[PDB]
């Protein structure tokens, strides 16, 4: 899926979220999926650059109180 | 890592000469070999030579070789009990790796499948 490129980059930058997946809940949303949704919203607002659209998404989540610890 | 088998055998499509000429097909059997019976080392042979050394210098008189004879006797008894325990522990407990019989039962449940079903 198109969002797989966003997930591959998120896992490479921020690693697997210390929050544990709950695959029993059919509506579970991980930190990566919450990142993918914000990334998708900003892309529909006109932004097309990749490197720029990825840095703005991280800021939006930090403003919402999400923990994003860069792996390196 | 297992050495490669690509282009090693004489086959159609493989241009080069064969690298390997296995006299048996390289296909895993559903069993392993039986562990060979091993020959242990002699025990107390050091104390045996010390005893037989005093005999040569004391005309084979046991009265002068008591400490050497006793040492060779105590060692033989200790080596006897240890030999008695080595069987109870190593033969039955299967310490470390499994025995062939037990390992073959495990392979029976996951046999190699060189054919289609």
């Amino acid at each position: 899926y198109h969002e797989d490129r966003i997930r591959a980059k998120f896992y490479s930058v921020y690693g697997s979220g210390q929050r544990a997946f709950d695959l029993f809940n059919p509506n579970f949303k991980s930190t990566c999926q919450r990142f993918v949704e914000k990334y998708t919203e900003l892309q529909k607002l006109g932004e097309t650059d990749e490197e720029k659209l990825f840095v703005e998404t991280g800021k939006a989540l930090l403003a919402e109180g999400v923990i994003l610890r860069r792996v390196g | 890592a297992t050495p490669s088998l690509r282009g090693r055998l004489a086959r159609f499509g493989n241009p080069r000469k064969p690298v390997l000429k296995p006299n048996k097909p390289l296909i895993l059997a559903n069993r392993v070999g039986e562990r060979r019976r091993e020959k242990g080392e002699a025990t107390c042979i050091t104390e045996m030579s010390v005893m037989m050394a005093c005999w040569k210098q004391n005309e084979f008189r046991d009265d002068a070789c008591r400490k050497e004879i006793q040492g060779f006797l105590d060692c033989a008894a200790r080596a006897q009990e240890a030999r008695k325990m080595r069987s109870i522990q190593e033969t039955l407990g299967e310490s470390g790796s499994l025995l062939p019989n037990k390992l073959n039962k495990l392979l029976q449940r996951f046999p190699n499948k060189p054919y289609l079903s």
Partner: protein, 86 residues
């Protein structure tokens, strides 16, 4: 002959333990293949015979390493039967 002496194949003895030092030396010569090399050189192995031996030893390594990989892969399954009676 032209090299320095007491560097190659030399092991120091610790606390008078000569047996352990000899076993260490023998283990070194074995792992580096010198022992088997010396034995195979007592008589001349003809080239066709050496090629056959190398092929046999290489096929044995491939088979033994694949059997070992399957044993380690299945060893976890040696636990107790979880559905005893069914």
């Amino acid at each position: 002959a032209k090299h320095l002496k007491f560097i190659a194949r030399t092991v120091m003895v610790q606390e008078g333990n000569v047996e352990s030092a000899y076993r260490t030396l023998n283990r070194i010569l074995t792992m580096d293949g010198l022992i088997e090399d010396i034995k195979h050189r007592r008589y001349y192995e003809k080239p066709c015979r050496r090629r056959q031996r190398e092929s046999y030893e290489r096929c044995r390594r491939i088979y033994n390493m694949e059997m070992a990989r399957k044993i380690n892969f299945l060893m976890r399954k040696n636990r107790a039967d979880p559905w005893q009676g069914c």
